[PDB]
Symmetry: C3
Subunit: 281 residues, 3 copies
């Protein structure tokens, strides 16, 4: 199924009938970082498998729902169970849910992820406001927009200079200052490692030379689809570890250690993003 | 359809019957840079859609013709409507038209493109003679030659050391000196960004570190197919902007600004390439 | 055919019945470096085409056998005719033979390849013990593990920090010292160029900046599948040429020159690896 205007419209039609919610904010949460979705008020849970033209996700399994409702007086739509390109989903399968968000009315997309730290200033448990990216799949002919252009959503050749909204970064930092956790909050450049292997120690060292501050396996495909169709983005990484220090000390990593860091910061991130949603212009 | 010997031959058979032209020069022109094709003498226009085994191009639409005739006393064949890998064409679809050129008799291929400037010496409106390249798709398992080798055209493992002919670069510079526009003409290394998004500001900064002078979304796939089968290449970029200056000043870009630069230099480029064709050994 | 548990088991069943050999060492040899396979004792030769669920290799042609038997008192299984991703094989086709090795009992995989030298200390005819890698296809969304995870073999997110066993590197160097050819043996970082074109002179210069010591078109896909499923690896490159010196002097390369270097070192490499096999703990 192509992520075109007709097919995105059929999915939006079904959602509108079932939920009665008209959202203007969308959220996509990282692994272990989705507790906010369980606190949406007057919520409606829609399994992907029920929605016309949504991508098939039964080979990977696990949760896959769209959740609509209210947070802080604001109408939102959330993806519960994010789609990652290392699972083998096509460009069209990744893009269709973001384009349905656009047709539903979404004007701002908030995204979190887990990432490895490259910059020597970053420690486990820190947050990084993403201000730009290095897209190795895009340079290498695996950009999420390779294929015919869907003209109703955006232009053939997008400019990504302003993909990460500066005012949303400033609001996020302001709220961290108000609650006295600004000492945890950095800004930086995100490198997209297609995955699913963690980057190797020699790859981490290369990324340090090339000006990257953090590395992860998500987020950039969704940012590009959002920017193409005029949706503003805030993206925040939670740092699991410092890859460069771990290479110097020959320390390993595994998904369990990553999820332990997510549990340690889950409740603070939930409170932060509730306030960002409440305060969005 | 595979870009093999049998299928390229069937296309060449059809073309030979309809045109009666035996070309020894091929040309592929960048966007907004194709006016020379409309001045080919005693010309024959063949829609791709009419030619056996040519790739299907109706999803993208717009012009798609092969044009044969004479320039400066020389027999040429032109692609009007270039095929780009960011549109989703396969390796086989890109390679088949170049291999038909080879079977028709082409010994020299001339190519222009629009590109972003990285080297601090480059300004909007400058020309760069391409002397080498950095092929991010090729390093990343999206090289145009991935697949079985077509032995009748070339070897399994090509050497690209001499893909950009030195004597053709010297002729191009000589003719610019004769007409007193050598102040516009540089040489440099071309980075292939698969596209279709312009490279991000942090990607431009990375490319400066890695020794790239210009960046674009075309040309390298065709150069590799030509080099594989023994066709000599001259490739020239027209610089739309300096990506590094625009990042320092937070200036945006869009396809309209690119095409305005092409219109500004179209007539000079047409005159330059007519003389290069006339003067080729 | 997916490289899953059921399909790998059917292939292992067939092999077990025909060979009666239970191997605990696997070997994959580079081009022109396979003479050891012809000296396996009490050997059994099984054409890939006869084995259930093995990948189809008739478009490329040439030899394709699994060979089982004894070396130095140890039970081994060899791939005669390696599968390379530049030929167009899928992730699933590359992974299935390594996963059959795992089900047969393989605990250690030994690999050789031919490679270009980047580090200024490397000369034609030198050996490099691989201690880490830079995987441009993996960064760029062409990692061999993209797709659903096969949980019976390994985890969704592997750590490659220890993919190249340190004790096996130390054994290999010890045996070179015993036979007084340690002056030929270096260690270094391997860059994976997807291929099939040799990397360009400007790509070689980029790789020098990024900390790479050698460059080649194989090995990293097999290493990742082995590490995922708990098989220890030793990988050794034979250096064909120094790419940086050849760029400074405008010297070309071709597959014939590569194979001449392999013939020059074939007999020494055969003797080295026989002793490594004999001495493995
Ligand atoms: N890519 C990525 C990534 C990620 F997506 C989430 C968390 C950490 C990541 N890299 C860590 C690299 C590393 C490898 C081995 C030991 C220590 N560190
Ligand atoms: N890739 C490519 C490219 C091209 F193919 C043609 C013309 C310009 C290109 N990059 C410009 C990068 C850039 C982004 C945002 C603002 C200014 N500059
Ligand atoms: N990639 C790779 C590679 C290889 F797989 C085996 C042997 C040599 C390799 N590069 C040599 C680069 C080069 C290009 C032109 C002239 C001299 N040198």
């Amino acid at each position: 199924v192509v992520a075109n205007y007709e097919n995105a419209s059929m999915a939006a039609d079904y959602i509108k009938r079932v939920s009665n919610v008209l959202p203007d904010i969308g959220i996509i949460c990282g692994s272990g970082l989705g507790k906010l979705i369980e606190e949406i008020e007057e919520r409606k849970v829609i399994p992907y498998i029920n929605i016309p033209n949504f991508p098939k996700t039964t080979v990977a399994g696990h949760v896959g729902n769209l959740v609509l409702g209210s947070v802080g007086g604001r109408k939102i739509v959330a993806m519960q169970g994010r789609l990652h390109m290392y699972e083998g989903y096509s460009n069209q399968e990744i893009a269709l849910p973001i384009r349905v968000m656009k047709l539903l009315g979404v004007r701002v997309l908030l995204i979190t992820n887990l990432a490895g730290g490259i910059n020597r200033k970053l420690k486990s448990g820190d947050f990084v406001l993403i201000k730009g990216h290095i897209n190795f799949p895009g340079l290498g002919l695996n950009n999420v927009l390779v294929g015919p252009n869907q003209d109703e959503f955006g232009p053939r050749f997008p400019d990504l200079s302003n993909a990460y909204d500066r005012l949303l970064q400033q609001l996020a930092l302001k709220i961290a200052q108000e609650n006295d956790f600004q000492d945890l909050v950095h800004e930086g450049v995100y490198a997209f490692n297609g995955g699913p292997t963690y980057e190797s120690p020699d790859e981490s060292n290369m990324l340090l030379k090339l000006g990257c501050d953090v590395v992860g396996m998500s987020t950039v495909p969704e940012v590009i689809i959002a920017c193409h169709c005029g949706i503003k983005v805030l993206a925040v990484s939670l740092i699991a570890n410092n890859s460069i220090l771990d290479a110097e000390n020959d320390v390993s990593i595994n998904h369990e250690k990553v999820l332990a860091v997510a549990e340690k910061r889950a409740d603070l991130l939930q409170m932060w993003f509730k306030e960002i949603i409440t305060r969005l212009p």
